[PDB]
Structures are given as C-alpha cells and as structure tokens.
C-alpha cells in the first residue's frame, strides 16, 4: 500500500517567476558578495535565469498525468481571481534563512500578502490532489526565493563545506530586495532541458489579473 508514496519523487512544480529587475540584481549582488568571501561557494549559486518562488511540487509520470496537471493549473485561475478581486498581490522580499544550513533563500516579508499567498498554495495543493496527482513534500511549505544550494556542489560538501555559515550573508539580513506582483504562474519541469534564458521548461502557464 505504502509503496507508490514511498517511491514518490517530485518532477514538476508550480512556479512564480521573478521578473522585477531590482530583485534579480540584488540577489546577484548577494551571491557575488558570498563568493568573494569563499570562492568555493560559486558552484552552489543558482543561475539568475532560474529565480522563482515554488508554489507546489508534484509527480507527473506520463503524458496523461502531465495533461491532468495542465488542466489543474488552468482550473486554478478562477479560484485565484475570486480571492484577489482584481487587486494586485504584491510580494515583498526581506530576510534571509536556510533549510538545514544547506539551502539559502530570501524570505517573503511579513504582512497580509503572506496569508493570501498561503491560501493560494493550499488551494493548489488540494485541487491538484483531487485530480489524483501526488503532491507536496515533508518540508513544511514556506514561500522563499532560493539563491544557493550546497547539493549543487556535492564534492565540496565532502571536502570542507558541509553547512552555510550565516556570517557570509550578515550584511544583507535586513535588506529590502524589492517586490514582485503576482501575474504569471508556470507549470515547470525539474528535469527537462532549460530554456535559452536559463528558466525551466514549461508545460503550460496562466496569468492573473491581465490587462
């Protein structure tokens, strides 16, 4: 019984791309400031073309399941529009944290937008699961913009750097990186070859509040 859930490995995700150039440039400066202190950490830095907020992870195992995931994303749009009622959902970024001292990310600043984004993420989780898709992960959901992952440098983890030293980013711990307005949400593949601009391959996409 427990096997398909035991063997589960996400391979797709819902993604909010970062498009505000102020955020993109600020994250690049943060990454460069860390590299200057320890040149070995360059290999852990995520490519700027990939900057995004993950909204939901899931497993889609064949063409039919990918098509069902596409359907679920298209069906999610009216739920989001009903929540927001045409007003921008503005996501400000401030605060730096880590998961297990292995993934470093910039946090969403506190405020009313947090609960709004959390409700969107929970609606996505529920509606995708009701179509029979296996979703989610053991890590508790926390919206974040990842800038580095030690898992991208596995040899370094065995040869000197097992954890991210928080002192590396201390100068940025209260910096306001900028705001992203919710617009596009993509269904992205984790494994497929990336686009020429460095962003993930997309199976489909929706836009919220378009004009």
From Swiss-Prot:
MF (Gene Ontology): nucleotide binding; protein kinase A binding; protein kinase A regulatory subunit binding; protein kinase binding
Localization annotation: Nucleus; Cytoplasm
Binding residues for AMP: 54, 144-146
Tissue: Expressed in brain, heart, lung, pancreas and placenta.
GO biological process: modulation of chemical synaptic transmission
Predominant subcellular localization, coarse grouping: nucleus
Residues that coordinate or bind CMP: 54, 144-146
One GO location term (cellular component): hippocampal mossy fiber to CA3 synapse
Top-level division of the source organism's lineage: Eukaryota
Record keywords, A-Z: Cytoplasm, Nucleotide-binding, Nucleus
Record text on subunit structure and interactions: Binds cAMP-dependent protein kinase (PKA). Interacts with PRKCA; only the cytoplasmic form is capable of interacting with PRKCA.
Function: Probably targets cAMP-dependent protein kinase (PKA) to the cellular membrane or cytoskeletal structures. The membrane-associated form reduces epithelial sodium channel (ENaC) activity, whereas the free cytoplasmic form may negatively regulate ENaC channel feedback inhibition by intracellular sodium.
Protein name (database record): A-kinase anchor protein 7 isoform gamma
Annotated gene: AKAP7
Whole sequence portion shown: 76 to 286 of 348
